[PDB]
Amino acid sequence: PVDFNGYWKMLSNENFEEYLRALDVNVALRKIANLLKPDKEIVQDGDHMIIRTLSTFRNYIMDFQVGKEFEEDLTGIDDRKCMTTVSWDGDKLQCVQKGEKEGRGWTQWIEGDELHLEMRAEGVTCKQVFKKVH
Numbered sequence: 001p002v003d004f005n006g007y008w009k010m011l012s013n014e015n016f017e018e019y020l021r022a023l024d025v026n027v028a029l030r031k032i033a034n035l036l037k038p039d040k041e042i043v044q045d046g047d048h049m050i051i052r053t054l055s056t057f058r059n060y061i062m063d064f065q066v067g068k069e070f071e072e073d074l075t076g077i078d079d080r081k082c083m084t085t086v087s088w089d090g091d092k093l094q095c096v097q098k099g100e101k102e103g104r105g106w107t108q109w110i111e112g113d114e115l116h117l118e119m120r121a122e123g124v125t126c127k128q129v130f131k132k133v134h
């Protein structure tokens, strides 16, 4: 396990448009979303974690307990509900989102002062990197 606490800004984004296409997100929103460089505020307190993907255009908030399955309301992305579980896999943070879509989930880890995040859905993989600014 590692410590994700902090405020992070996006450095890079790769294959995000195809990842959103796999979720049936409309073209217009896909183009707009891929041009946004959202911040990430993570509050880690024990096994309780809050991850806020921030943008004035639109936000997405996660508030969960590691190891405990919860009903994830993805309103704002594709408006789906998934039975999600986020667990530790060594120093990596694994998330599996069970629902209508195949292979939906993500993996997060740290390299120096950078947050690495890979998102997957329907066999598609998106890669993002963030820099710890606070």
Ligand SMILES: CC1=C(/C=C/C(C)=C/C=C/C(C)=C/CO)C(C)(C)CCC1
Binding pocket: 020, 025, 029, 033, 036, 038, 051, 053, 055, 057, 058, 059, 060, 062, 076, 077, 106, 108, 117, 119
């Ligand atoms: C579609 C869409 C967006 C998607 C956000 C996503 C897919 C966030 C995933 C966050 C995760 C996995 C956080 C855990 O570290 C954002 C809000 C950028 C802008 C508006 C359009």
